Structure formats: structure tokens, C-alpha cells
């Protein structure tokens, strides 16, 4: 493949999100600030910041249809941002009623409701009441046991894949009346009342991420044991047809994105993304998209010479510092789509603790 | 400092100040020294009269050894009856000191050097006995071994000045051998003293310093002549360093220096063990600094703007 480094953030970024037109993107940093960036010719430049929160901002997600930004942070509060006609953005607090720090947020594919993961044993799902202009949260506390580490919606807009930190993968129905209509019968189930245990699957570690297939009839989750498991549901209260597990020889995976109806791209502490080709019969690692082991008479400038003396003085080597082969320098955060019709993705972006926002061109 | 001083510095400075002064002042200070010896200075009777007292646990043994006469012919008519709680006392009045400055300085030095002056009585006695046996053996060479043995038996002298220390000295027709019953408590002290004593033995061996008195050290066993001597445990934890002083080592021009040196030996060893501890401290920190240098990798280059001095950039641009 081929990758282009979009920007070099000065600080680690655990999340990013692009607008529908892919014109400007929002990203988080280490502190309570949330950063905005816009294109400057061939590069990107700073746009504005948000200091509404008080503690470390955890996750940020952009709604492409309505062009809205939500932000859930460690301060147990959620802010929803909508741009004003003049150009500025209007903040709006959402009362999550949580007891611990939020961890992960996602917009529904219809963007009517958004679910919030949390370490307070619960998950908060919020919608908008036009009659009161209010956001109200509902707690999902029946089967949950540990911290929420990831979220994943379903194309039916009702099922919600929750990646818990109790070595068990969770799927729940987030259907709510007055917002969503009745959903069609699904392989996951048909009778879907609010807060019902759709499915439960085990793992060999904390479920860092979960993901439904583009067809919507599967789940893929990765534990902390560097193993990605692809689930194929059969019927309600019926064991899945096949639980394919692929075990790797690298660092544990972090986030999972579905390249197409039969391909999964996932990246973690290995500083690189991977690809999975297969079907119901099985799966296997296909290729290392990060070039693998690439290992990538003249005057000396004043800055270089000063650097050489500083390294010599503070050090005993005065040699090149890292020269790390992989494009990223630290653990990767997440993978999100960039362009293409559903089930047809060729470009997807990624962010990491090094601050690099590296687009990946399949 | 490498060599420990041979007298009490406080007494020397105090005596010099009070002799050179014009208006004396009443003083009452008790001062301790090495090895448990304690000095007391007071002016009870007259502001111009100063009394100095000596405290030592082993002093009665010194009296048995004949130290009163040595003190008498050392300190002249200055001798005064001892005070309560002390062994030897001296009373000095500033109205009778010699006018010449050098006499005053030497008197102050002599008074400040009272420790070895009272402790050197066994050494002087051993030297006199050595001279006697030397002339007697020079009278007839064939009469040496039996008088040597009888001197090793009868003239075998000993003293306990610390409860883990002992000096055993005895003369001969040509030499005055001395045995030190060294032992260190405070475990780490003994730990470093093992290395110190081992290196101290080797020293003499080196041809570089053969002129020094012969050293003999062997722990867990005492020499032949002092196993029967009371007070010498059967090698519980005590070392035994033995110095053999030949005729050349106490020539009439070098007796006092040798006496003071052989007396201060153990205190020098202790102080230098402490100095070695300090040497470790400084070296150890000095190159854990090098370890910090090694660590200072893994820090990406960053820029601080001004941080000028004792402040914060002192400017807005």
C-alpha cells in the first residue's frame, strides 16, 4: 500500500474525526483542549480549540450527516457541538448522570442517538427531545460487569456492540421508542426490547475493540492476547455457527475496522495495521501493510552542529537517536474510514500517541 | 587530613588564647578525647588560676607501671593534688609563666600533649630495659638466650585502655616487640577493617618501605608469648597486629615521634575507615551521574524559549 502523513500533532491524539466533505477534521490531545484543523494548501493548519471541559478529553466523534461534534471526557460530562450560521460552534452539555469517567462515544448511523461508554459499570444512550430541547441518558446495567473499552453500532440502528474489559464481548439492543421505528428480524434476533442480552462471547483478554461486518450479520472483536475473533451468529439463544479465532505473533491489537464484507483491518501496539482475508471457513493474516521491515562533500548547518555537541555533551554517543522503521513512533489509536461507498473502502485514516495522522491507501 | 593530630587541639588553642590575653575569664568546660579519655578545664579558685584534669579508666595500671614519677619530672612543680572524679590534675597561674614567647608556646604544647605524655610511661620503661639488656648482652654474647627468655617472661608488660583493645609490650637485648589486640564492633566497621588490616600487613612487605618496623598480624590466634597472658581471649573475633621495633627505630633522636605514632595507630585506622566511607559516597554519586547521563536518552528534542536567569524570560517576546 501507500501512506501519506497528513500532519504532525505536537501531542498524543487518541482520536480523530473528519467531516462529511472531508474538509476539516477534529482531534483530541493529552489535556482538556480539543483541537480543530483545516487545510492550508497542501498541508493543514490550526483552526480553533475547545476548553469547555475540565479534565482529560477521552473521545471525540463527528456526525457526517448533520455535521455535529460530540465530546465525552474524563470529567463525566458530554458536550455536543453544532456550528452556527456565522461559522462559530455552539456548545451544549449532556447530562450523562455517570459516576466515573467516560471512555468512548459513537454516533448512530442515523445520528439520532449516541451511546456513551463509561467506567461507572454502565453505558449511557442519549437522544434529543425536540419538545423540550433536552438530552436524556439511559443506563445499560443488566449484563455489564466491567469497564467499557469500545462501542460499535449496527446498520439496523438498534443493536450496539459493547467491548467490555471483563474478557467478554457484549451485544445489546439500544432500541428506544419515540426515536427509532421497529427493526426488521435479524440473525441476532427479532424481539429487541430496550436493554436485552443479545449475545455474549468470551475472549483471552480485555476487549479493546468490537465491530459489526458491513453486511451487519457478524461481529469481530480483539482481546489483549493479540487474538482477533470473528463471530458468525446463527439464531437467538443458539451458539454461533463458527467462532473463527486468528492468533498473531505481534503486540496486542487496539481497534478494528471492516475493509469490506470479507476483510478486516486492525491495528494496535504493533505500530502497524493488518488485513484479514477469509470467509466462514476461516481467516488468516494476509499482509503487513506498513512495508514490514523496511528499515528506511556537504556543509554542516549551525543547528546540526549544535545538536551534535549537545548530544556529545549530554551523552557519550552523539549518534542518530531512533531511526525507527515503522511510520508510527508509538501505539496507534484507532482506524476510521476516509472515502468510498459502504463495503468499498480504499482509504482510511489513523492516529497514534506520536501524534501522526497517517492516511492509509489500499 | 591524612595523619591524626598528636594532642588535644582545644586545650592548645585555649591555653594559647589565655596566655596571650590580658583580661582572663572564668571557664568551666569538660572535653572528651579519643579512646574514652576526658579532660576537664575549670577556674574554681581565682580567675587567673586554671585547673586541668585527666580522666582515664586504665590510670591505676599506669600508676602500677610507674607513671607518677614520669609525670613529676615531665611537669616540674606544676603538679597538684587530683580533683574529685579525675586522675591527674594540674594547676597553672598566669603570673608565673616565663616571659619569653617560645617558652610559653612550648608549655602550652606540652600541657595540650598530656595524653601521650601520661601514656608513654610503659614505652619509656621498655626502652630503659632494652638498653639494660643491650649492654648486658654486649658484656658477653654467650649469655643472650636465657636473659632474653627471662625478659620475655618477667618484663612482659600489658595494659587495657579500651575494652576491645590491648597493648602487650616487652623488651629484649635488641628489640621491643609490641602486640595490639585490635577488634572492631559496629559490624560495618569490622567489615572495612578486615580489608584495612590486610592491606596494612602487605605494606611492610613491599621493598619500598622495608625501613619500617616489621609487622605481624594473624587473626584467630595470638602469638606464643601472650596466650598465657590474662585478658587475651582465644581468638574470638580479635585480630593481633604486632610491631617489632629494632634498635634503629628508637634512636635517641626518634623516640618521641615513634611513641606518639605507635600510640595514635588505632585512631588513625578508625578515622581513615570513615574517610573511606566518604570516598565511596562521593565516587558513587559522581558516576551514578554517569548512569543518569546514560538514561537521558529517550527524550525527544524540545526547545525552551528564554528562561534567562532567576526569572521567566523577562520579556513578552
From Swiss-Prot, chain A:
Gene Ontology molecular function terms on file: actin filament binding
InterPro entries tied to this protein: ARPC1, WD40/YVTN_repeat-like_dom_sf, WD40_repeat_dom_sf, WD40_rpt
GO biological process entries: actin cortical patch assembly; actin filament branching; Arp2/3 complex-mediated actin nucleation; cortical actin cytoskeleton organization; endocytosis
First and last residues of every WD repeat: 8-47, 52-91, 97-138, 143-182, 202-241, 327-361
GO CC, one annotated term: cell division site
Family: Belongs to the WD repeat ARPC1 family.
Function, in words: Functions as a component of the Arp2/3 complex which is involved in regulation of actin polymerization and together with an activating nucleation-promoting factor (NPF) mediates the formation of branched actin networks.
UniProt name for this protein: Actin-related protein 2/3 complex subunit 1
Gene label: arc1
Swiss-Prot record, chain B:
Alphabetic keyword roster: Actin-binding, Cytoplasm, Cytoskeleton
GO molecular function: actin filament binding; structural constituent of cytoskeleton
InterPro entries, per database record: ARPC2, ARPC2/4
Position of the signal peptide: none
Example of a GO cellular component annotation carried by this entry: cytosol
Function according to Swiss-Prot or TrEMBL: Functions as actin-binding component of the Arp2/3 complex which is involved in regulation of actin polymerization and together with an activating nucleation-promoting factor (NPF) mediates the formation of branched actin networks. Seems to contact the mother actin filament.
Quaternary structure, from the entry: Component of the Arp2/3 complex composed of arp2, act2, arc1/p41-ARC, arc2/p34-ARC, arc3/p21-ARC, arc4/p20-ARC and arc5/p16-ARC.
Family classification: Belongs to the ARPC2 family.
Annotated protein name in UniProt: Actin-related protein 2/3 complex subunit 2
Species annotation: Schizosaccharomyces pombe (strain 972 / ATCC 24843)
Gene from which this protein is expressed: arc2
